[PDB]
Design a protein around this nucleic acid. Structure first.
Ligand SMILES: OC[C@H]1O[C@@](CO)(O[C@H]2O[C@H](CO)[C@@H](O)[C@H](O)[C@H]2O)[C@@H](O)[C@@H]1O
Ligand SMILES: OC[C@H]1O[C@@](CO)(O[C@H]2O[C@H](CO)[C@@H](O)[C@H](O)[C@H]2O)[C@@H](O)[C@@H]1O
Ligand SMILES: [Mg+2]
Length: 580
DNA sequence: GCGATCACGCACGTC
DNA sequence: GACGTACGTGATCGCA
């Protein structure tokens, strides 16, 4: 049965009530400078559809959008807020975001439209967006009657579902997590995305040119060494060259053929000079295709900025992700790739990039949650944690810790945080399962509080059905009761890891909210550009650097109070590369 | 049948 | 442990 609404030709006062469900529809996946295709409002007075050209040109409607005392409930308010920012319109007063509510209640549902959220509460009187707009290439905005009914049904669902969602959040003790953390964060991310990051495209193009020259040389050397020409980028052609023509050992298999992962190739390098060249080719080609060509494709040519979109409602642990471009995986480990960061520059003359990162936040969170006396003392002394771990597991003095010992202890520390397993550690360190098991046993002997946490958290996951983070984010783990060893073991590792990774995510999100409040109080021009899981990147006038050196680390260190200190390192410079 | 698209396995970049 | 993008390849679709 059809849903009744007014297809309005002009904005009226009853559309401007002080509580409403609002839909401001942006169909393009990337909403930056994208069209708004229609607007729906549902409130005490009825249901309304407005054409955007009309509504967004109407002073009363625009004033209503920007009035913080006029409360709106929405789904994915950041998309609307950013699309409106590109049109110079402020959206304020969003008091409920159904996307973030659904995400907090259960991130595993993968809710990404109103219909998916609605089905959580047995409400089905709204179509999935994919049904209305189609998917992929065939995607398209439908004719007005179809569009208007869809937007009004979405607004009506939001209007109905706010109360039951808030009720369930309150039962879970997650209502403050929504209202005081995720919703305010959404506004901060909207500002970050809209500001964008300035790119030195000439520098990127120069790099592109160098890389292409190097790739040509290496490509030709590979042909020479192979005694043949082939698609180095093909798994089938390369496999025939390495494991048939050149007879290299097959040390590892993939589902459907020969593994050629770098870890495998590293092992084969002693047998034939072609291998080191394939590795080099892959290094350069990744930089060329993903970073140089990829970034240049998405830079806006007018302003030379890139505008990422942070997906706030995707990861199972409460981290953000970043897309189009992903600015959370710009190279840093190897110097050649690291130079890519020289192309990320401040957006104004005489400004600088300032970067601040937490030192070992996940192990500090683990020390806190596990109340492990040895680990807490280590951080209270601000020790090098990997050297301390080596001292304990290998039973030696600090002087006797060799580089290889520190390297292996570091890998153990990562294993412990990720959800230790003897097979996984063995693969990482390239040792036997028995040997890896001995490393883990020694670790738990030195850190018995961590051992107790790991046992207890798996038991809690089984008993309650989920694990929780410091600020009450939850992750359900139904596979924890599986009678399949591999399925169950993966869930156990999630039970161990999620409260650590997720609590670290909670802390940095709170730090962002606190930082923006402090920046506004101090009336600094500095602002956030990016978050990369445990680090915040800002730009500001050079004259603000001294103040930021004190202000940013303090805010990040004081965001929460743990049983150990939090420690933040910081650097600044004329490009992201130099903020090291 | 011939591009256009979709789907998936794979490899590799970050924290 | 958590992500996103690029690529090659084979399948499928879209329309005659
Ligand atoms: O707008 C972000 C918000 O939208 C969702 C879908 O509800 O993701 C869409 O937007 C993305 C960013 O452009 C795409 O990466 C994604 O493919 C698209 O479905 C949410 O998942 C997200 O939180
Ligand atoms: O032997 C106990 C030890 O095994 C683990 C897995 O490493 O859990 C297993 O043992 C349980 C009972 O004590 C089950 O509840 C669990 O499902 C099973 O996998 C550890 O958590 C536990 O300490
Ligand atoms: Mg760090």
């Amino acid at each position: 049965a059809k849903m009744a609404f007014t297809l309005a030709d002009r904005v009226t006062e009853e559309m401007l009530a002080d509580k409403a469900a609002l839909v401001v529809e942006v169909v393009e996946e990337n909403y930056h400078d994208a069209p708004i295709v229609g607007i729906a409002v549902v409130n005490e007075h009825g249901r309304f559809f407005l054409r955007p050209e009309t509504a967004l040109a109407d002073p009363q409607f625009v004033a209503w959008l920007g009035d913080e005392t006029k409360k709106k409930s929405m789904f994915d308010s950041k998309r609307a807020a950013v699309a409106l920012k590109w049109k110079g319109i402020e959206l304020c007063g969003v008091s409920f975001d159904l996307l973030l509510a659904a995400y907090l209640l259960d991130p595993a549902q993968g809710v990404d439209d109103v219909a998916a959220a609605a089905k959580m509460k047995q409400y089905e009187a709204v179509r999935p967006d994919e049904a209305v707009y189609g998917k992929g290439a065939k995607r398209a905005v439908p004719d007005e009657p179809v569009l208007a009914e869809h937007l009004v049904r979405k607004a009506a669902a939001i209007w109905e579902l706010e109360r039951p969602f808030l009720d369930e959040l309150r039962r879970n003790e997650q209502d403050r997590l929504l209202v005081e953390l995720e919703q305010p964060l959404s506004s901060i991310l909207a500002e970050m995305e809209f500001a964008g990051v300035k790119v030195d495209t000439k520098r990127l193009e120069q790099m592109g040119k160098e890389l292409a020259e190097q790739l040509g040389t290496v490509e030709q050397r590979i042909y020479e060494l192979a005694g043949q020409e082939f698609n180095i980028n093909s798994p089938k052609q390369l496999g025939v060259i390495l494991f048939e023509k050149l007879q290299l050992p097959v040390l590892k298999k993939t589902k459907t053929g020969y593994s050629t992962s770098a870890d495998v190739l590293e092992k084969l390098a002693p047998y034939h000079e072609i291998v080191e060249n394939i590795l080099h080719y892959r290094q350069l080609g990744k930089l060329q295709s993903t970073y140089i060509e990829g970034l240049l494709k998405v830079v806006r040519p007018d302003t030379k900025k890139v505008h990422t979109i942070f997906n706030q409602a995707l990861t199972q642990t409460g981290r953000l992700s970043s897309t189009e471009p992903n600015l959370q995986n710009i190279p840093i480990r190897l110097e050649e790739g690291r130079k890519i960061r020289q192309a990320f520059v401040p957006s104004e003359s005489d400004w600088l990039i300032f970067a601040a990162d937490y030192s070992q936040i996940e192990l500090r969170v683990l020390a806190h949650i596990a109340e492990d006396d040895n680990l807490m003392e280590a951080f209270r002394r601000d020790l090098d944690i990997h050297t301390k771990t080596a001292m304990d597991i290998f039973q030696v003095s600090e002087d006797e810790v060799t580089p290889n010992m520190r390297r292996q202890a570091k890998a153990v520390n990562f294993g412990i945080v990720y959800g230790i397993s003897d097979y996984g550690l063995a693969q990482n360190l390239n040792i036997s399962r028995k040997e890896a098991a001995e490393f883990i046993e020694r670790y738990f002997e030195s850190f018995p509080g961590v051992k107790r946490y790991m046992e207890n958290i798996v038991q809690e996951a089984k008993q309650k059905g989920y694990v929780t983070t410091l600020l009450h984010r939850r992750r359900y783990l139904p596979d924890i009761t599986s009678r399949n060893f591999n399925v169950r073991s993966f869930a156990e590792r999630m039970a161990m890891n999620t409260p650590i990774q997720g609590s670290a995510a909670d802390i940095i999100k709170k730090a962002m909210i606190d930082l923006n409040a402090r920046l506004k109080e101090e009336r600094l021009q500095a602002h956030l550009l990016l978050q990369v899981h445990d680090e915040l990147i800002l730009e500001a006038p050079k004259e603000e650097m001294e103040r930021l050196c004190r202000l940013v680390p303090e805010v990040m260190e004081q965001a929460v109070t743990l049983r150990v200190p939090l420690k933040v390192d910081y650097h600044y410079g004329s490009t992201w590369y130099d903020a090291k």
